[PDB]
Amino acid sequence: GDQIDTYELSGGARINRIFHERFPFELVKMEFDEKELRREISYAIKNIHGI
Amino acid sequence: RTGLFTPDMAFETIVKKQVKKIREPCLKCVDMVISELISTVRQCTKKLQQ
Amino acid sequence: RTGLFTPDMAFETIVKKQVKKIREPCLKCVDMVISELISTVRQCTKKLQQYPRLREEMERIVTTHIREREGRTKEQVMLLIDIELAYMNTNHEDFIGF
């Protein structure tokens, strides 16, 4: 439709496309220490080979 | 929606906004023309009749 | 009106029309997998021959359960396509511009 709010805002449910371009930020906010990953992998291997 | 091509309303809604600005000077022009007609009538009336 | 740029709804329309065609092979795949699982179960039940009336019961129960899962599998298969029709994501990996 016409009569769009060209000046005042970026708004009117166009905020949701930010969430769809903000969720890609939450997916990389998470972090891990690689030393814990290596320790966990080592124990995963030692626990898969039982004897 | 995700945009592939520039929408045609992004042109139209800027053009309409620019066009609305010229309402004022046209009315100023009309008022000036009326002023000149009044001045001319005064010259043709007040100065030549006793 | 006269366009300055190529409209975007033609792209969405064509994509939707082509995507709708995928439902058929997914159901064929599901039916093939169900058949293969039934074959494998009926092979596994050969060893249970020392006793009668226990091979039929175990085949009946496992076969019935496998067939019952057909409904839930097909429903999820249909939903994963309706989800691919609801929205049109052009910011994944594509020819942006042009």
One-character DSSP codes across C14-29: HHHHHHGGGHHHHHHH
Q: Which chains touch A (3 or more CB pairs under 8 A)?
A: B
Residue to test with chain B: of C2, C5, C91, C96, most B Cβ within 10 A: C5
Answer whether A17 sits within 8 Å of B9, measured CB to CB: no
Contact call for residues C91 and B4 (beta carbons, < 8 A): no
What's B20's DSSP letter? G
The answer to whether A4 faces chain B, any CB pair under 8 Å, is yes
Header resolution in angstroms = 3.6
Residue environment code for B21-48, b if the CB has 16+ CB neighbours within 10 A, otherwise e: eeeeeeeeeeeeeeeeeeeeeeeeeeee
Burial class (CB in 10 A: 0-12, 13-18, 19+), B5: middle
Answer whether B8 sits within 8 Å of C6, measured CB to CB: no
CA angle, A16 as apex, A14 and A20 as ends, to 5°? 125
Which residue in chain B is spatially nearest to A4 when comparing CA positions?
B13
Show Cβ contacts of residue B42 under 8 Å, excluding neighbours closer than 6 positions.
none
Residue B35, token pair as written in the block: 């002023």
Spatial separation of the C-alpha atoms in residues A47 and C17, rounded to whole Å: 51
Residue found under tokens 């740029």:
C5
Contact call for residues C55 and C15 (beta carbons, < 8 A): no
Answer whether B2 sits within 8 Å of A17, measured CB to CB: yes
Show Cβ contacts of residue A5 under 8 Å, excluding neighbours closer than 6 positions.
A11, A12
Question: What SS3 class is residue C55?
Answer: helix
Nearest to C94 by CA among B5, A27, A21, B6: B5
Contact call for residues B2 and C91 (beta carbons, < 8 A): yes
Rounded to a whole number, what is the distance in Å from the CA of A24 to chain B's nearest CA?
15
Rounded to a whole number, what is the distance in Å from the CA of B8 to chain C's nearest CA?
7
| Structure determination technique employed | cryo-EM
Q: How far is CA C58 from CA C67, C68, C92, in A?
A: 14, 15, 48
CA angle, B35 as apex, B31 and B41 as ends, to 5°? 145
Residue A30, token pair as written in the block: 């998470």
Find chain C residues with C-beta within 8 A of B8's C-beta: 1, 3-5, 7
Spatial separation of the C-alpha atoms in residues C34 and C62, rounded to whole Å: 12
